[PDB]
Amino acid sequence: PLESQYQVGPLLGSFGSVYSGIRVSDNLPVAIKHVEKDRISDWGELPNGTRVPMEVVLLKKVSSGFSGVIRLLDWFERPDSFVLILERPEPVQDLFDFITERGALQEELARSFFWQVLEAVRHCHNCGVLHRDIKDENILIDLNRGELKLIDFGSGALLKDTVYTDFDGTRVYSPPEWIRYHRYHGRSAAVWSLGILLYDMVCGDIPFEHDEEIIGGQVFFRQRVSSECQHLIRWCLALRPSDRPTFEEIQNHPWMQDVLLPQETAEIHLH
């Protein structure tokens, strides 16, 4: 019984149905996420053949213990819904609100955050999972540990090397081949969204709001940004997918060198 193991609190987040909670067994803070069956896009089968939302399949595949992706602790099926018990770091703030309040981030801080997101996305891919909705809204900052967590696998898919023709992530983070042709490959689409995210961090908001900007191929910098950072962003935002860097090329890029540790990041920029 779910009503027995957890103390449920008020709504959580910053739209959706995620509630604050505490696990009674040990007062562990949790996030209790409800997903209505009639609203589920993709379904998956578990090992025992039980039909679950794909989000549960993907969360189980990444739930090893690497701290950069949100951990699914448990889940329950109800007549009309599924309930996901997720870890809840505290104190946290999502990266969207963090950037809103602080404006464009110092490049040392953006480098630390971007590096952690890259490591989290690599973990997903290594576990066979494509997130498909990388954006600042889906990134939580543990303000005491300086550790970022990727959340909300509700738009994700199993990672494959063939073409994707479906998409339900965030359009202003989606790549021009999706806008133009309704198709994309997983890794190069992820790199595009990471380019959007990095611009967001160093400029204080995303570069594109309209389809014509997404496909237009021009990146205007509204804030002072180093030449090395600009180059990496423009490379991630290459119009042709095959022109975009691999994850290895991103992390070997000159702008990415000498990253801060999470604890250094917390002490320098968050405390």
Partner: peptide
């Protein structure tokens, strides 16, 4: 200028 969230 207006910064906003974007639904999925």
């Amino acid at each position: 200028r207006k910064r906003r969230r974007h639904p999925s």
